[PDB]
Assembly symmetry: T
Homo-oligomer: 150 residues x 12
């Protein structure tokens, strides 16, 4: 139990999000990942906190980073992307974050897409889930962490 003041918010991004804003804009929009990071920096600063913003295409690396967050961060905002639908491993890693606030974010409204995107393993552990609010959902995520970590 670190506060926004003692430790950053870890913002994790799963596979293919490195290409945000360069494909399927109608689905993901035209902002890049760097735009999202900046949005997150600003949203956190307004509460007196900071962020640690990461993206990986590797499941295992996401898991390693969650383990790091348990010791060094005050909450996790995660867009696990494709692994949302397939990774029991990320679910179990988050389950080890006892007491740590987790908010799941999806840019697109997964409930309107293919049936296999309707389910998310992460949602079983996440305190909150935001879907289809575009990149603004990331801000919502930071804000909810601020309120819970508070």
């Amino acid at each position: 139990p670190r506060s926004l003041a003692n430790a950053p918010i870890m913002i994790l991004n799963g596979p293919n999000l490195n290409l945000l804003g360069q494909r399927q804009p109608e689905i993901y929009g035209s902002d890049t990942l760097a735009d999202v990071e900046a949005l997150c920096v600003k949203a956190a600063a307004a509460h007196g906190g900071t962020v640690d913003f990461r993206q990986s295409n590797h499941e295992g690396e996401l898991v390693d980073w969650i383990h790091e967050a348990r010791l060094n961060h005050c909450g996790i905002v995660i867009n696990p992307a494709a692994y949302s639908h397939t990774s029991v491993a990320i679910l179990d890693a988050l389950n080890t974050c006892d007491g740590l606030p987790v908010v799941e974010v999806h840019i697109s409204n997964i409930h309107q897409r293919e049936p296999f995107r309707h389910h998310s393993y992460v949602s079983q552990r996440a305190d909150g889930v935001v879907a289809g609010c575009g990149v603004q959902g990331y801000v919502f995520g930071v804000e909810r962490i601020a309120a819970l970590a508070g």
Copy 2:
């Protein structure tokens, strides 16, 4: 296409929400519906808008109100509650609101509850879905409408 300045945001609440803050606090919290309304009034005022906040236990009345919103409001934030899981009628009413922003909100994280709560008919039409962020999710809802209606 009314703006936050020309027309209020309709905030609809479904069945049993009149008892918010008086039962199952661990699930729904201890804020009342009146507390929620005030949060929404405040969030909207910051963007220069107003709200029209209603609650009903009757599916058909929620439908009538959605029809009204099509003509007189700039967006809908809706917590359909139990009707989320059963009402094709509310989905079809929302489907007539062509171009109108709709955000679905749930206080609890439905994905951690009984399987029949996992599915929502509204999610197929909603631009955004926020679940398990407590009453704070209503604020996110207002905020997303402001940005969309903008």
Copy 3:
């Protein structure tokens, strides 16, 4: 057992159909509910009968009206709309209309839409089911009632 001459045909319309001809024309067409009523009045008059045309967004009100029909009308043409897919209540009300001819009508061809529209509880009781014949299906409905009530 009233005849077309002793009692009107009750035409019941379920939710959202009050907006017929103002949205999703490619699906529902551009005729209004008033245009449909007129079609029904004409079709019935050719057989010497009349109609009692109603629309509601409330499941329970549709049930009440079915009860009324049992005593005072010669048959029912019903477009239960969304409730087609959810209402066991309307099915059971129609099951009390022993001997009364019922025809179910759907403007759109439900079998080509979302899977949850594929099933109708009313179809289990209805004598006939007409789908995807546009508003002309209402005429077919009145005609079948005329032949059965005859």
Copy 4:
């Protein structure tokens, strides 16, 4: 926690039951709803209590009545009829009645009927469930509430 002496037993009846004893007697029998009420009044009086017997075809009205029962009655005997199979809303309304005894009754043996009648949302919350004991089941219901409220 009101006793049979401080408050009546609310007996709720759902849709189409107003026609009890006038159709499908082989299924529902030939007693009317008024006959049932009388049975209930008698059963309760033997234990020193009273009843408040209601029937509605409207889901939302049943919900309102359940809310009223939480504040003013000592238990609920409910035959939700068709809404047994479809209403998550009634379930959640009953879930707010913390500590209040609920007994679910069905005149017919739903397990021998159509598959969609096999499931009941209410059963998940009801303390007891009686099916296929005819209208005598209502008496069993009053009796169990007397023993639990005791």
Copy 5:
């Protein structure tokens, strides 16, 4: 795009319909296939058209006839009978009739029979579907073609 005046309506009947009116009258009635043809000839004549009425027990022959209709007829009224539930081939044949009006007709109400009759491949392509209106459904079918071909 032929009109009712330039080309007949093809009426296709699938397997076992050659025995119409000689078995299971309670299901299919006591009119024969020849009686149906006469009804269709009359309904079409009222609009200034003609019909080409055929029956076969062979899937492939139905398919051949559908091919013929694309070049020579103004619409198809089809009762595919058993092949309704099993023939992807007839579906695909109809899918080649781009722009040609197709109405699917069932004498019995399939939705009240065995579960395997509840689904029809043809319903995915057909403009309209009529079920359980007895042989009168064929007249409806001719009438809808007349209005679409018009």
Copy 6:
């Protein structure tokens, strides 16, 4: 067709019920099987009848006893316990008791437990089913038999 006066009510209890009142009291209560027998003896005597109360852990023995009931008893109150969910054999045995009233009883509310307990083969044949009314359900069972055997 023996009456309560010519023949006893057979009360059958399935496996593990010999341990009633010694484990999982919160589920099954703290009354023992002997306590239940006494309740039954009393309920029956009030109507002028007697009971033959048995318990077995063997499926085939329960079947044997059902066959004996066909010839010598006036009705059966059965709590098949675990065999409720697995024994087609008991169902068929009961299906041979033509005209004999059968009431199924469960102490716990099976609908609230593991999904495999949600279904009962016996319910298909039983006239009435009582669940979740504790050992009082046995009295309800005796009483219904009295009214039916009457």
Copy 7:
């Protein structure tokens, strides 16, 4: 209702059976279709009857031959082969044979093979079904027809 003496037993064989005894002997054996016919002729003669033995690879032709049997034969022994699992059309043709005895035969034990062979449409109408008794099952078939036609 023709007797074994007035009319032959029609023995129908579905697709690929023309190759019996030339492939997959371990499954279908090494007797040919001609061997089977001879077994059938002998089995029927012992009861004073005759057979009309046919094979086709065409569904519709099997349907035409069933129609013929209704007028001219005393019963049907049918091995529909692959069509067993797919042909609603053969089912409906047999359903028109009111009062005619039908026995379904399979050489192999279909219940031990692929799951799609586990189901047969014909079994819903057939009076008797024999599977896995090799070609001897045809004799069983003839015999049962003799006994029923008797």
Copy 8:
């Protein structure tokens, strides 16, 4: 590998068959179990063999008897009745009878009854399965064993 001459055929009957010919004649007929035994004794004698005919309502006893047959009989004709649908234990016992001919018999045509009767564990092991040929199916059973044991 005993022959019909060295060892009897064991004919096993499952639960409730002791009441054959005294209930549901339309389903099971009016012959008794003794009548069936006599049929079997006769069929077997014609091939020079004998039978050992048993009935039990206990699964475990059927199992024990199957073990005995492995050492002392030349084949098994079995009608497992309700245990057909539930007993993996009988299947596994039959799976220990390496090389021994087993024929499964059902008097009724299970494929026309309740869905839970459609499946039989025994069918996976049985060489042949005869269903719906009435008690005559037992004779077919004896006859197949004679040909296989030969």
Copy 9:
């Protein structure tokens, strides 16, 4: 076991393919069946073989042709079209072609179309399956047969 030199490659085409290149070009392309035949003739000639190219809309006729191939051809390239999804009969016919190479071809990528097109009975027997390579897939088919027959 005939070689490309002793016997032709049979190329079979199922229903509706006679219309290739005249409808749904975006799905099937604009080449005609005659174009495909020419591609096949060329591909085979390069390896020293010939082809026998056929199309039918009749399931049973495809079956007959497969039988012929077993005796007279060196392999089969087959596009069963709609029958891919429904014909157990074609599968079983192919199963009699022991040792004969079979390659299944689909012009469109069935895995991207309607769910009922995702499954093919032929795929269980075919040595190779080619889907969504347009008409070029037929050449891949000829080439694989050449390499296997070699």
Copy 10:
């Protein structure tokens, strides 16, 4: 809570295991049940305990023995065999053994066999489950009981 020193370990074996080592060796091996007992006696003696080894083919008898264990033994190693997959009765008996260590053993690796063997009712209650370790699994079972009873 008896210790290995105060009470034996009950080793229960379900149906058909009396034939261990005489059939399907590749599956169950060639050791007999007597060989397993000796392995269990030895494993237990090393910890200072004893065993009470039993086998039955009767579900109810297994249940009775479980009841006996609750009072007189220190843990249960059970191989329910076929009943693993069907017996809710054995599960509930084990559920009465509050605090008593249970280990489930399977000789074969059920997860590689037929789908119906994949599931076990006992596994829900068992502390530990061992599958596919041959007879050695029984030793692992004794060992775990020793460590838990310790």
Copy 11:
């Protein structure tokens, strides 16, 4: 949109394919991955192109390579091996390769193997799918890319 002349074809191989030709030859054959590369190099050279042939056991590394291909290669031939069945992440990476030809290849015929191998996430995006043509499938893959990239 690079041509075969401007950019190589990327050939990706998923997990365990580094062991090709050293295990399960009957399934995968005896050619090695180096043998496959050589076939690919030759097939491409005939069209004037080159290949970039890679193998990895890491999902994320496949994803990275697909990203690279979007910028630097003219098409992708991919055998995702096990990830075919589990990786939404590879699917989404391919989905970013707008306009890039993709062909999926499987050496074995997956439709004849375990059910979990029947489905592939890649098949939803791949232009073409080749299965069960052995390593020759890779050649087909290069050839199709050549024709599409052309």
Copy 12:
């Protein structure tokens, strides 16, 4: 085929197990991974062997390590953790270890947890599976490998 004396036992641990003994002790216990390693070292030494103990959060790395085991180790004891439920890749890597003994271990009893943990891909290949025996299951594993490798 290396013996315990020629080569170590590879013990593989999947994701999140690095945190063993620091979270969810009631599920996984309070021993650490280092404690487990020491148990394994000891169990193996008693049979004259050694162990090579590894843990990774990366699927691909586990696969690489399995490849290494094929050439250098005498067996594999694996706890794939979350990848148990999702990784077809690990299954296939194990499938390449022809003849190598594999034991699957799970500390918790997965059959009592969430439904998605009930299935394991590794169980299809593993010689033995041990679940819910705590960290003692690793010792069982080493022992079974010793006996098989022997």
